[PDB]
Symmetry: C2
Subunit: 38 residues, 2 copies
């Protein structure tokens, strides 16, 4: 699904170091975040 | 910021018990996910 929400710089940037190092993409970064949150 | 990406089920939906139940919102759910993603 296509999701649009409020994630600022500190978090978009977040999805740069994580996704990269993780081999993930902006979405596969964010999907993952939800599967390992908490 | 406004960001649109590809998140399928069991995560895009997962943001219900992690957001509502947690008092969070679609964004504060997803932002948060990034802040505690492992």
């Amino acid at each position: 699904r296509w999701l649009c929400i409020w994630l600022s710089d500190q978090t978009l940037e977040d999805l740069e170091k994580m996704a990269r190092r993780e081999g993930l993409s902006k979405s596969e970064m964010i999907n993952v975040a939800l599967q390992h949150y908490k």
